């Protein structure tokens, strides 16, 4: 993930221009190899034509080049690329939105599961750990970075996400499927046991816990679905064929013919097809957006930070359910105890941001005395 | 379903170009017959123009070819194709999203339905089987593969989804409508009976169970709706006519005219219309995307694996409600029992994915001592 | 509703071509009259130009025809048609999604409202009938077929959807508004009475019933909103003007001028403007899609089957609440009672659909021993 | 709100053509003033060119006209208009979807709040009136028509929406913000008091009431947000300039130059620029769609009927909570008491709408005896 | 935020043209510097070509300009801008929709947390202050203005948002992540303590409170996610490159070539490239819309008023939970106590907005007596 929100906070002079001097997760880094290959092929063709062709062969090449440059359309490429990239971006944001966060569940567990003793600590930590374990199982199923971190369930046990007992239970339950769903059944059964044992004081609280856990399960299932059901290969191939055929044609169409022949278009013989290179950057970067975002759990610069998410979730959830359980800051009257209209101060840097409240678009409408009179 | 997520995890050199060497669920497999027909017709027309026609007939054909080429437009093909395929893909993903997964309901059943005896086992298994039976009924109504697997309710009984008693009950209830809704009424009544019998300890748990079952029912109803209410046939016919008229026009417009006449835009008689063939591949594959995705429950390569989903759902739900009920791994303190900030290790292959936490885009904003001062 | 899902299950040779032989709900049926009028106008103009006009008038008409062609642009018409039709299709699907299905409510009623006696039968049937009556009231307000079936509340009473007592109560309550909301208040009060009288054992069950009823009410309100708030007449008129101006400009710009004059684009004189007729079919069919779908509750072939929905809902809900209440198939051990991994068989037709489970995209990643070792 | 759903129910001959004869909320009514200004400017320029310019000045004007007509196509007017109007229409429908309806809350109040005496009547009426008061407060903040109806809180008191005591309470609570949120706090506190006083029999019922009230509050907050956060003024200005400069250029580029000069496109002097007027209608009406829908709470013909909504909501909610409380039609066996499959009759006008039930797309699949045999 | 809803309430004459006279948040203010740079470059090139070079160099430059003019195409830039800006606008609206409002939670707290004594006041104020503190923490993480107002937790304490005890607790809990999640755990634990102490009378009320708190937490998490996961930098660079390449090729292809050469499209020398500057306006203004909305929490004119939102939320929530708790206006019969159909009056300015109720689109259908008869 490359963040530039602070850089694009305000629309200043050359706001997006300054972003062109970025390397990580950039168009240059994404397409430099493809551009080098295209440039090498283009100049090899130019040489071959200008040095290894007789007069008749040169005339044939000029006719073919004129025909190729004639038969090239940007409309299909722009349409297909725009629609495909829009679909890929929508799926990318959906996949992020289906990343499970244990915050709601951890707050509920910390609040509801009672007991400051070892048994209560164990119960809360085990519940939050089951949530984290389900999340990590799905994450290592769908993300290459997470899989490389935890290439095996033994690695999961070594990292502390799973205990040897949980590992043995999983191996005993093993089916010929992905077993990322097991920790949710474990969580449901453990919560039912906690309620039956008095640790959870109420079936309403039990239902809230299970609703949060089921929301997490739905998110993990959506992640699995996005991993499994790829965008149609036919659609991907159509977009790729359009984009690549455009520049395969350009390799011959955008060739500087001999100026001596005074062809209408090919009057001035440059050496660098600058506009063709600009088109290459534009279209191939548009395709590279989809190439990078199609699987957002790879190891691209703009791919999600799944390992950091896992670490943060584990630490935060464990802290919330163990250290922060029934550990509140002292409750005392605040600074505005007897002030009906509190007004927090502004600093010098923010004094300009003090704005009058918006009272509605009809606030300033003016009406006459006769107009405002109710009729009988 | 064809999966290439592992192949497109990272945006590497020629990432999408490498996907062009795939056969299953590919543009070639989808449109090779249409392309062969188009090629045959095109070359038949070329041979007729070259041999059969006399001088005047050939001149008339050349004028007709110039006019037909002049009247080929791709804006009012690209526009309609893009909009139609976007609609089809949206409906395709919605149809997948409405595939019922019994995971949430199965966790709820395993937790809530009490009793480790034969009666409890039977009750839990019957509830989960009612859910699975409803899912399979809708799936065999909407999916050709599932129908081929279970072409009759007797087949469903033989497969184990339905018991003979349930089959008899369905026969008794038979109405002149699709009876996929009956298992949900059965589930509601059985849950009420279980709660009245003490197996479910609270109406709150009963309500959670029924909410999950009703979510599954809504998903099945959406599947039925998508099966019944097809995309408007007028819209489909409009798209089909656009594409087919474009290429029928190309059949005459893209003929290679005699170089002897030296017309403005041919000047060179190749035998293969390479750009016309590329356009055919592009546009016909764009159409074939919608052709394959319009019914995602057929037997295409990229259609959903409904039979695998059915088998997996049956296995997982039965295991969860039968063997996993009140069967938990031993609860013991974890590896980070007294560690304030757990830090799971990284392997050598994943050490580069360790990142500092993102603290917000305002973290690096710098202010002077006077700027940060609160004002009165 | 025209269904061709079975026909388009698989992407076969000419899958969408086979759909061009359909008449019901087809582009031909939709626009044959408009095409006839356009053809008549075009050929009247052509015959006037060919016979009635003198030499000077014919030269003037040739100038006008050559001048008209530059104003026949397709980019804006395609843009406006695409966006308008996308909006209309989105609204059409939303309108179907707001069609009320009493399945969830009926399952809840059958489960919760207790009593196999006459009083319980009457209570359950009355609740489900209130739901169906509200649905039918909204449907007859918004659908021409349902209105023609039930042109009056007396017709509703005769058809059995309403009792004479309910009709008298509605007439007593009559306000100067659509009274489709009354049955929901009736349902709420009757459910409260049932709970107070012991027929509903718990306020949790009562709340579930009322949540389902309120979901139905929201769907009915959305149907009313779609019926009332039409797409802006300005937008509809703008799209209509675009299409009509395009095709009335074509009436003069697509006339085949005297080939003798040797104008740049009028060498060939075909009596039939095939490409103009193709464009007419394409664009007027695109507009006819919106014309048919703008009101999905009319009597078009692709309009919804509201009458069938009403009949099916009544029958299914009555059966579920009355005969299916606490009438369950015998609970007995299933086929896989003691089979840890059930495996339903495949028929000869579906044997090829047996697929291995998808374990994730990271399953096949290869790592060395050094790569998989944890670092300290 | 202009409704033409009945007119566009069926896709008949000239369905959208017939809508071109409408005046209210029509393109003519929306843009006749702009069209008159444009016509006046166009013909003033025509007379200036034809009567006030010498030979050289007329030659210069003709060159300018040809230049403008050649370079007019540089305006991305269709693109900008489509992409802007789509957003405007989406926001328009969202704003409608956020209009609060008290139907669900009123049914809940009528059912739950008990007591047929004066105290219960007062309680239910006060709750529903708090809901209506919050709705009307937000509506008068965001709607010009509602503000004109109720230009002050004293007007609200006179209209009966608020009592003098409520007005005094609002004045006492006055903060420098919009006080549309106060009635929701009042509703919550009154519901809590009613529950504590025995008028509400269960905290579950109290929670249902508060959930409905909170949904209404969220809708009102969305209305406030839409009123406050206008569409980007930069975007609106870009679209406005794009549309206006097009016709400003047309004023000179679409003039009829002297036919004596025999310019390529100016051989005929047909005084009226019919195609330019058609373009004006198309583009300016496409912009008028956005101009009318950008604030759907103004006084346009297609703007929402906020005053009618307010009146209807008040009447319906008061009736439902006061007259309809525990006032049900007599409950008796219905027409289909012992009919397993009720079949409501059809009229002569609707007999053709009786259809066979749709049983799925796989229903008609035919398989041999061997294909259907289960395999081992 | 710049609001013009009142100005655009009605679609009046020149409604959108009257917005072109605004400066704040305007296209002029956004792009005047870029336009000045473009002007300087264009006229530098013009002066070089006119009087800097010999005749041979002038011919070379003329050929280069005539070549460049054919490469600038509107469709690709327009499409990329449309898709990118649509994505940016959608994300901008979602970001606003994720702004946390404490109104629902504050009403629930005021209703549910009992006690008019100091303990009750402290409990309610502390809960609402925890909600406001979480909101402010996320807002100062994501918003430049809020960060400038509260550049440190000490600033938060001095402003009254956090007590010294809460600051100490946050320091003791400090983890290497953003700690905005802590107040939600605090809220859960404090609500549990209040329920166990009798201040909250029912676990259902506790669950409602925690549901509202969790909704706020999810909104804050979405704000953090939008702050962290920027739109892909590759996509941003692609759009920027498209725009800049277009307007850099324009710098040479839009030069007014010598009219004496009588080039095909350069017969007039206007000095000022009016249409090129109009295109710059349109496209750079589209890009500036995207640039301004990409980070809606910066300090642009059209960025959100986060500081005002913070102040208003604090004041309103404190008032609601402290002064408005169990403080209701006197309950008395309203104006329409015994009026079956209340009819609030209309003023003279709004009398024209009184409309008849819409009874449905089928209301006016006319049927004969024989048509309306039921068939057997
Ligand atoms: Ca990736
Ligand atoms: Ca298919
Ligand atoms: Ca219709
Ligand atoms: Ca308006
Ligand atoms: Ca900004």
From Swiss-Prot, chains A, B, C, D, E:
Changing residue 22 to A: Impairs inactivation of ligand-gated anion channel activity by sulfhydryl-reactive agents. The chain crosses the membrane at residues 31-50, 60-81, 237-254, 274-287. Residues 51-59, 255-273 are extracellular. Changing residue 220 to A: Impairs inactivation of ligand-gated anion channel activity by sulfhydryl-reactive agents. Changing residue 91 to C: In VMD2; loss of cloride and bicarbonate conductance; does not affect protein homooligomerization. GO terms for molecular function: bicarbonate channel activity; bicarbonate transmembrane transporter activity; chloride channel activity; identical protein binding; intracellularly calcium-gated chloride channel activity; ligand-gated channel activity. The keyword Cell division does not apply. Changing residue 84 to H: In VMD2; decreased chloride and bicarbonate conductance; does not affect protein homooligomerization; abolishes membrane insertion. Ca(2+) binds at residues 9, 292, 295, 300, 303. Predominantly expressed in the basolateral membrane of the retinal pigment epithelium. Changing residue 324 to T: In ARB; possible decrease in protein stability; loss of cell membrane localization in transfected MDCK.2 cells; reduced chloride conductance. Changing residue 40 to P: In VMD2 and ARB; no effect on subcellular location in transfected MDCK.2 cells; possible decrease in protein stability; reduced chloride conductance. Keywords: Calcium, Cell membrane, Chloride, Chloride channel, Disease variant, Ion channel, Ion transport, Membrane, Phosphoprotein, Retinitis pigmentosa, Sensory transduction, Transmembrane, Transmembrane helix, Transport, Vision. Interacts with YWHAG; this interaction promotes the ligand-gated L-glutamate channel activity leading to the positive regulation of NMDA glutamate receptor activity through the L-glutamate secretion. This is Bestrophin-1. The chain holds residues 2 to 377 of 585 of the full protein.
């Amino acid at each position: 993930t490359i963040t530039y929100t602070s850089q694009v906070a305000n629309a200043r002079l050359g706001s997006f221009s300054r972003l062109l001097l970025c390397w990580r997760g950039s168009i240059y880094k994404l397409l430099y190899g493809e551009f080098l290959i295209f440039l090498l092929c283009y100049y090899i063709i130019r040489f071959i034509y200008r040095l290894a062709l007789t007069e008749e062969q040169q005339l044939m090449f000029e006719k073919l080049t004129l025909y190729c440059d004639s038969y090239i359309q940007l409309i299909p490429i722009s349409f297909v690329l725009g629609f495909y990239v829009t679909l890929v971006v929508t799926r990318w944001w959906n996949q992020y939105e289906n990343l499970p966060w244990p915050d709601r569940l951890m707050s509920l567990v910390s609040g509801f599961v009672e007991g400051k003793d070892e048994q209560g600590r164990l119960l809360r930590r085990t519940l939050i750990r089951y949530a984290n374990l389900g999340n990590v199982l799905i994450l290592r199923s769908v993300s290459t970075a997470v899989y490389k971190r935890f290439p095996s369930a033994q690695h999961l046990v070594q990292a502390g996400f799973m205990t040897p007992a949980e590992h043995k239970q999983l191996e005993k339950l093993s089916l010929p499927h992905n077993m990322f769903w097991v920790p949710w059944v474990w969580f449901a059964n453990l919560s039912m046991k906690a309620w039956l044992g008095g640790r959870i004081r109420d079936p309403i609280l039990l239902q809230s816990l299970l609703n949060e856990m089921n929301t997490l399960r739905t998110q993990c299932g959506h992640l699995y679905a996005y991993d499994w059901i790829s965008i149609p290969l036919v659609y991907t191939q159509v977009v790729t064929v359009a984009v690549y055929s455009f520049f395969l044609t350009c390799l011959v169409g955008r060739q500087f013919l001999n100026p001596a022949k005074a062809y209408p278009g090919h009057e001035l013989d440059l050496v660098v097809p600058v506009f063709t290179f600009l088109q290459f950057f534009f279209y191939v970067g548009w395709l590279k957006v989809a190439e990078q975002l199609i699987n957002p759990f790879g190891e691209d610069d703009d791919d999600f930070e799944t390992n950091w998410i896992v670490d943060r979730n584990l630490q935060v959830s464990l802290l919330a359910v163990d250290e922060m359980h029934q550990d509140l800051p002292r409750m005392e009257p605040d600074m505005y105890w007897n002030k009906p209209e509190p007004q927090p101060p502004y600093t010098a840097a923010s004094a300009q941001f003090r704005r009058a409240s918006f009272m509605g678009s009809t606030f300033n409408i003016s009406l006459n005395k006769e107009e405002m009179e109710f009729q009988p």
